[PDB]
């Protein structure tokens, strides 16, 4: 097979922003939660952006009679709503799937496994939703593997002292600001 309707897609190349450079005119309010999906978000069978369609877009072709009188028809995939169990998330995740995709999931032995397969083909035939799911699972796995220590209290201890010092000079200081200051330190 091929992933033509996926890998054809192109997204505007964001310029790498240095810390000292000037701002863009429209900077967003809330930050980027998820990583950027290489292949954007489908602009044709937008039905499939909400689910795990397995790179199965709608076809259009011809109904043909005994007289060979051609008439345009479309061929939809066998989509199905299906709440499937994630071991990593410890909850079942309900989404639209192609019956094919459900079969693949069953073969691979789980939904998390299906999401996390490292092949490029899989990545292509994950949606934007599928990509987000993968990210959620992978991040959770990483957390499970590696808890922070294998600092917050120190910051909390120092904060009031820092505030007092600021006041003694003359200025007031708030927590959030303190946190912002001492993130990289």
């Amino acid at each position: 097979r091929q992933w033509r309707l996926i890998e054809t897609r192109k997204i505007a190349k964001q310029p790498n922003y240095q810390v000292g450079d000037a701002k863009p005119l429209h900077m967003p309010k809330e930050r980027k939660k998820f990583p950027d999906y290489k292949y954007g978000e489908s602009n044709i069978f937008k039905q499939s952006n909400k689910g795990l369609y397995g790179g199965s877009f709608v076809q259009f072709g011809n109904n043909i009679s005994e007289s060979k009188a051609k008439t345009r028809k479309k061929w939809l995939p066998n989509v199905v709503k299906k709440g499937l169990w994630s071991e990593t998330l410890n909850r079942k995740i309900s989404i639209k799937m192609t019956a094919k995709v459900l079969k693949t999931i069953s073969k691979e032995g789980g939904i998390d496994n299906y999401l996390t397969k490292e092949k490029s083909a899989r990545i292509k035939e994950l949606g934007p939703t599928g990509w987000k799911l993968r990210y959620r699972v992978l991040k959770r796995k990483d957390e499970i593997e590696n808890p922070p220590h294998k600092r917050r209290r120190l910051m909390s201890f120092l904060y009031p002292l820092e505030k007092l010092e600021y006041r003694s000079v003359g200025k007031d200081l708030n927590y959030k600001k303190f946190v912002e200051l001492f993130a990289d330190v």
């Binding site: 980027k32 939660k33 998820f34 990583p35 490292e118 992978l138």
Partner: protein, 49 residues
């Protein structure tokens, strides 16, 4: 935020690092000389015939 690396990807990276760590095959001056001499001999033989 950058997506984390899955297990297979990490293993591949480790393998690549190990490969890099080994001594790299590099074409020595001596090897080039040996080749060049052989080429010359071949040319001489061609000229003769």
């Amino acid at each position: 935020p950058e997506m984390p690396l899955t297990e297979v990807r990490k293993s591949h990276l480790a393998e690549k690092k190990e490969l890099a760590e080994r001594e790299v095959p590099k074409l020595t001056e001596e090897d080039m000389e040996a080749i060049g001499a052989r080429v010359f001999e071949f040319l001489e033989k061609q000229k003769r015939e």
